[PDB]
Amino acid sequence: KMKRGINIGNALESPKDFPWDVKMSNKFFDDIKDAGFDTVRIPVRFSDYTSDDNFKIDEDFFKKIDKYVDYALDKDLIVVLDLHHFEEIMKEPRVHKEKFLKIWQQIANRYQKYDKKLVFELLNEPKENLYSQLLNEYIEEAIKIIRKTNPKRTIIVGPYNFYQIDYLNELNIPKDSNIVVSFHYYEPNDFAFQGNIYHKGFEHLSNITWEGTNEQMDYLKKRFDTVENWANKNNVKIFLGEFGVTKEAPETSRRAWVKAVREEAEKRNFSWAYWELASGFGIYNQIEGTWDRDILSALIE
Ligand SMILES: [Ca+2]
């Protein structure tokens, strides 16, 4: 089912009192669907909207999530609900374990009767102090809570260090048949992130090219070999949940990189979701509702 997706980034994963540059709109889902995408990933920073007692998600904000999820699902889109930018659990995971479990208890109970096309992604890009031994422990507990009401909804988990390929070997695959494993790919970092302010240490890079040389193509293929081999041994489908290039990158390289990465994902039966619809990595004009044909052609022929 899942194949061609796109992230609505820098939107609902913003901090609670500083919204970012993309305002979620139902028209997005109409244009996402009409462009040929079958999946939409929705980052949501639920952690910024909780009772800080039972960790009750702000009902007003939760009704907003109902708004967009319902609309997207009603357009026959696969919706990945993604717990994004849970920052404090990365700093002090043991202090925020319970808040993490209760957050997902509410999501699982509130959407238990929703269409199969709604997918749960537990925790985007674990990092810092939420290392694998703790990450695995929390994922197992969260999956057992969700399964009490959603025995069969697809659940997406990812490895430590920003969903990094190199940490798949530490990810414990749950003994659950409805679980997708996700990695993110932005290699090389300096090319993909160049000029983006939301990327610490990459805002001042300039004019870095990706020409698809033989060693550049060999590198990309070798990295995807690692994920496929790991996926083959553990019997799990792989979701390239994030990949993309900033708008500041040279046009030709940006298109070639996105084309090559998308092609590698499909060649190995990876589902994928382009990183970002209308922001600094965007390929879509939120004001006009028009697509960047150059990059869109790289994703969907
Ligand atoms: Ca990084």
Residue numbers in the entry: 39 to 90, 92 to 340
What text comes from the article?
We engineered and synthesized the soluble domain of ccsZ from C. difficile, corresponding to residues 30–340 of the GenPept entry WP_077724661.1, into the pET21 expression vector to generate a recombinant His-tagged expression construct of CcsZ. Our CcsZ crystals grew in space group P 21 and diffracted X-rays well to 1.75 Å resolution with a single copy of CcsZ in the asymmetric unit. Model building and subsequent refinement resulted in an improved Rwork and Rfree of 0.227 and 0.260, respectively. The model covers almost the entirety of the CcsZ construct, from residues 38 to 337 in the sequence, although residue Ser91 could not be reliably built into the model due to a lack of electron density. Interestingly, we observed this groove to be strongly negatively charged in CcsZ, which is not a typical feature of GH-5. Our structure of apo-CcsZ superimposed excellently on apo-TmCel5A, with a root mean square deviation (r.m.s.d.) of 0.677 Å across 252 equivalent Cα atoms, as expected given the reasonably high sequence identity (43%) between these proteins and the highly conserved GH-5 fold. The TmCel5A-cellotetraose complex also superimposed well over CcsZ, with an r.m.s.d. of 0.620 Å over 242 equivalent Cα atoms. A comparison of the substrate-binding cleft, informed by the positioning of the cellotetraose ligand of TmCel5A, demonstrated a clear difference between the subsite architectures of the two enzymes. The residues that contribute to the -1 and -2 subsites of TmCel5A appear to be partially conserved in CcsZ, present as H123, H124, N163, Y225 and N48.
